[PDB]
Amino acid sequence: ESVKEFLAKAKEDFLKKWETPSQNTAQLDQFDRIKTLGTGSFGRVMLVKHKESGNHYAMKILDKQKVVKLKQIEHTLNEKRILQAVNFPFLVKLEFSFKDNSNLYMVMEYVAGGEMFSHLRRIGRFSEPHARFYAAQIVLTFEYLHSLDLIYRDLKPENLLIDQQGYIQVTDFGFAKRVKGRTWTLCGTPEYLAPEIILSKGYNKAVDWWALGVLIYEMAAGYPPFFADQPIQIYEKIVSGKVRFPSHFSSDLKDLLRNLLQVDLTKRFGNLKNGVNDIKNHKWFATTDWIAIYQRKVEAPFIPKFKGPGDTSNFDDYEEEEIRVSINEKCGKEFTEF
Numbered sequence: 502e503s504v505k506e507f508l509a510k511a512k513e514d515f516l517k518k519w520e521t522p523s524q525n526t527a528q529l530d531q532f533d534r535i536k537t538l539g540t541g542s543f544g545r546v547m548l549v550k551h552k553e554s555g556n557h558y559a560m561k562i563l564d565k566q567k568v569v570k571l572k573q574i575e576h577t578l579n580e581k582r583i584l585q586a587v588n589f590p591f592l593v594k595l596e597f598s599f600k601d602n603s604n605l606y607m608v609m610e611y612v613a614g615g616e617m618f619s620h621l622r623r624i625g626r627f628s629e630p631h632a633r634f635y636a637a638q639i640v641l642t643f644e645y646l647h648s649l650d651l652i653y654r655d656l657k658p659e660n661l662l663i664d665q666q667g668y669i670q671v672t673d674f675g676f677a678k679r680v681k682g683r684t685w686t687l688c689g690t691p692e693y694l695a696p697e698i699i700l701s702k703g704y705n706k707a708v709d710w711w712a713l714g715v716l717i718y719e720m721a722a723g724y725p726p727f728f729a730d731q732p733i734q735i736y737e738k739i740v741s742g743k744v745r746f747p748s749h750f751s752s753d754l755k756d757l758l759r760n761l762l763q764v765d766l767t768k769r770f771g772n773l774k775n776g777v778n779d780i781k782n783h784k785w786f787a788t789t790d791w792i793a794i795y796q797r798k799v800e801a802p803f804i805p806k807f808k809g810p811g812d813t814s815n816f817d818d819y820e821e822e823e824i825r826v827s828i829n830e831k832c833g834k835e836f837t838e839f
């Protein structure tokens with residue numbers, strides 16, 4: 502349909518930004534750090550405040566020496582380059598980027614509402630209308646990113662942030678990559694890994710539709726379809742499939758999930774012929790108005806309450822360490838783009 506015009510338009514904007522990336526749009530001295538609020542292999546996300554404007558931001562700080570040692574230079578650069586190039590209603594907007602002698606910095610938009618993980622864990626499990634509202638936003642998110650030949654690869658409650666309006670903001674593009682065809686990297690989180698990733702096949706975008714199948718189950722059930730203590734046991738359960746559904750699951754959920762959690766790649770929804778429309782036109786999505794959810798005209802089933810003032814009460818506690826920038830420049834040749 503007419504949605505192709507939009508996608509044509511999005512391909513034009515992304516590629517101009519993808520070919521000539523925004524490098525060094527700010528510096529560290531322009532911010533005040535307030536609180537460490539995230540943690541990953543090579544850094545932390547910190548709540549900061551822009552001295553001149555007064556606007557709060559998230560600021561991921563990654564240290565070059567740990568990125569190079571662990572060997573994840575390509576992932577780090579992928580993340581930055583996709584983030585400055587993309588533009589979508591359910592994606593966290595990279596506002597600024599820069600680096601220095603020791604670290605890489607990505608100053609993103611402050612999403613006051615926190616992770617989907619916390620809220621899911623608080624109320625146990627979402628209602629199928631509630632899971633649907635979220636899943637709809639992720640279907641449109643993956644339609645956009647897969648148009649742009651981008652694969653996301655880490656879809657899970659923790660990387661989805663609920664904003665003021667109850668709408669999702671997708672963050673953590675560390676494992677995200679631009680590829681036409683297949684990739685061979687062992688990327689993702691165990692419970693979400695598609696069987697072709699586990700069996701070390703060259704996988705494509707269908708991996709993101711398997712991940713959507715696991716997430717919708719986890720939103721409506723309150724636990725993942727494939728779970729165990731050791732990761733090896735979770736991998737045995739995924740390659741077989743055998744997804745036993747909760748009895749409270751409707752027939753429309755059970756069918757959609759059997760199609761997204763389809764172990765055979767060539768028969769999985771979103772990957773076969775019709776594309777994203779196999780999913781858009783499913784009976785579990787019959788009540789979703791795909792344009793009204795895009796325009797954010799649908800009433801959210803959960804407005805996530807907050808402290809009030811830009812950082813007042815606060816949320817989760819982490820050890821506050823120094824943002825250390827050494828006298829000399831570390832690994833600068835490797836990160837010449839930032």
Ligand SMILES: CC[C@H](C)c1cc(C(=O)N[C@@H]2CNCCC[C@H]2OC(=O)c2ccc(C(=O)c3cc(OC)ccc3O)cc2)ccc1O
Pocket residue numbers: 538539540541542543544545546547548558559560561562563573576577580593609610611612613615616659660662672673674675676
């Ligand atoms: C201000 C708070 C609000 C809610 C806020 C938070 C984030 C956000 O992305 N926070 C995430 C919330 N999800 C779970 C992970 C923890 C945290 O992200 C990080 O702290 C973080 C993640 C990864 C890495 C990292 O080392 C990394 C690793 C890679 O390969 C393994 C590749 C790329 C990487 O960047 C560093 C920090 C974004 C915007 C926000 O307004």
